[PDB]
Amino acid sequence: VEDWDLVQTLGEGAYGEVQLAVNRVTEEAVAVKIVDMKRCPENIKKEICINKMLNHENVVKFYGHRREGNIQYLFLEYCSGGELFDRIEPDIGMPEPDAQRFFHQLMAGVVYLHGIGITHRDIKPENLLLDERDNLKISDFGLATVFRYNNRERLLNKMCGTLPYVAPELLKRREFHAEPVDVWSCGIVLTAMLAGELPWDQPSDSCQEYSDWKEKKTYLNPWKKIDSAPLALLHKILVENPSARITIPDIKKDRWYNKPLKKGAKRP
């Protein structure tokens, strides 16, 4: 019931590689993130320890781990749908109703995380996995960390993530709040789903495309493909000052967020 055959190598992280793992008698398929700590006892010890806390429907479940000398094995909910990256066609994005549905589920997980005091720190379509019913699942807590413990917030100073999805305060300020950095990356994800392209390489004044966004030139490419209603949400999310930036409770009160677009399940 636990003799796990490694059926087919499924993907490849920078740290190691994932394999599909189907059981003998039950056939319960799981994902097995495999990382050689030599090829450490801390960077992956924090990923497991955060994972042990996490239990949400929009967060890749963590089943267990095993030590195995040098290599560590992370046993995680299998998402047969793959990445949300592959449901975004270049230069178009995806149907607006699918975007809104994925965004509702992205906010649900991110709220949950922020409630248990942790921040993902690297939200992007590659780390957002769909299951078999296409439900979204926040993946990879390798860069995640505690920003709140015993009801006291601590600020972040470690710079990390992916440059196009990273918030501007991450580059300028010495220290910053965690939650608005996640909101920013979620707003970049919305842009990708609706436009099929990333707006810029990084939110730095040395980047022309970021300065054009700050000048409200929404006649240029990423933003011209979008639509007033969702674009107005992105206007409230992609605000340079993280204090002025919209918070998740207020994203839930947004017009487009609560605009009805998508039907129910076909014959279910």
Ligand SMILES: C[C@@H](O)CNc1ncnc2[nH]c(-c3ccccc3)c(-c3ccccc3)c12
């Ligand atoms: C840190 C982990 O959560 C990432 N791995 C997964 N974990 C749980 N479920 C997963 N499903 C996939 C997947 C990859 C490609 C096709 C279908 C599924 C994967 C997957 C996706 C991309 C690369 C490697 C594995 C996956």
